[PDB]
Design a protein around this ligand. Structure first.
Ligand code: NI
Length: 305
């Protein structure tokens, strides 16, 4: 048996999704301490804030990490997964699970991650758009020829293009063969492209205040789907990833190579679990959406750990 614990990225959060989790004894207290540490009312954005407030990239990133750490903590009340990984921001969440970074240090890093990427996006008119349908390699060749970069390679043939708004518009007018729709994502800019270069500089400064430990659990990286044994290499990869494509496809290939038998996606789950059901047939999957999902999760943990 091999259980893989994964954490989601931007887009997974929805209004009021943290509500039930804050109701768990001690949860409001932990989140409040985190909020004071990063200067952001996490409880508010996870409970009362509407769509426009949580779409704020500087808010969404730390909120997602706190949700992942919180739900995982609840699920372990212990256990140790066979491996961990996450989608973009979810990588910071996974660093906590592997013991590379403690939670406050991670939330502090991701708070800076979100602000830095927002700022980088502001000095530019860029974005990201998902390609629905078509062939992944032909699609990549086409979008790249138009000047875009394959910011997200999520597996199951899914591709997300990123670049300037002009290029994204040219992509929609001249779509790759077989692509039915080019859907713009709800993001501030071309994340995971060179357009985030200034975000790397800012994020690297925040990484200076950290002292990462070597992962205690196998840590799979978005850069190339490889397992990283060094804590400093984990951190360097996190800092650089804001400007590098997300190869979630390779991460899933690695889960296969590891003989994964079950995958649990922390709160707010659904997105990575949906991908797993497509690219990882025969693998049990469970997404944590509310505390009521915990009992089923514990059973899955018990039989796969
Ligand atoms: Ni509003």
């Amino acid at each position: 048996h091999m259980l893989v614990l994964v954490a989601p990225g931007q887009g997974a959060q929805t209004p009021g999704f943290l509500t039930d989790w804050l109701a768990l004894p001690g949860a409001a207290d932990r989140v409040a301490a985190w909020s004071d540490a990063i200067g952001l009312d996490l409880a508010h954005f996870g409970t009362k804030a509407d769509a426009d407030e949580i779409r704020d990239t500087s808010v969404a990133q730390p909120l997602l990490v706190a949700a992942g750490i919180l739900s995982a903590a609840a699920l372990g009340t212990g256990f140790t997964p066979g491996a961990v990984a996450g989608h973009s921001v979810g990588e910071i969440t996974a660093a906590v699970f592997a013991g590379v970074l403690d939670d406050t240090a991670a939330l502090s890093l991701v708070r800076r991650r979100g602000l830095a990427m927002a700022e980088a996006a502001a000095v530019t008119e860029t974005g990201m758009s998902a390609l629905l349908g078509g062939d992944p390699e032909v699609s990549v060749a086409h979008l790249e020829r138009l000047g875009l970069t394959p910011a997200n390679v999520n597996g199951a043939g899914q591709i997300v293009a990123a670049g300037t708004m002009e290029q994204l518009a040219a992509l929609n007018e001249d779509k790759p063969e077989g692509v039915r729709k080019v859907v713009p994502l709800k993001v501030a800019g071309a994340f995971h492209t060179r357009h985030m270069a200034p975000a790397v500089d800012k994020l690297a400064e925040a990484a200076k205040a950290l002292t990462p430990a070597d992962p205690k659990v196998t840590y799979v990286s978005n850069k190339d789907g490889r397992a990283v044994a060094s804590g400093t290499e984990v951190l360097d990869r996190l800092v650089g990833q804001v400007a590098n494509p997300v190869r979630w496809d390779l991460c899933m290939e690695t889960f296969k190579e590891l003989g994964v038998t079950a995958i649990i996606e922390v709160c707010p789950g659904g997105t990575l679990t949906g991908l797993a059901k497509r690219a990882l047939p025969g693998v049990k999957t469970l997404a944590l959406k509310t505390p009521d999902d915990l009992d089923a999760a514990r059973e899955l943990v018990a039989e796969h750990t």
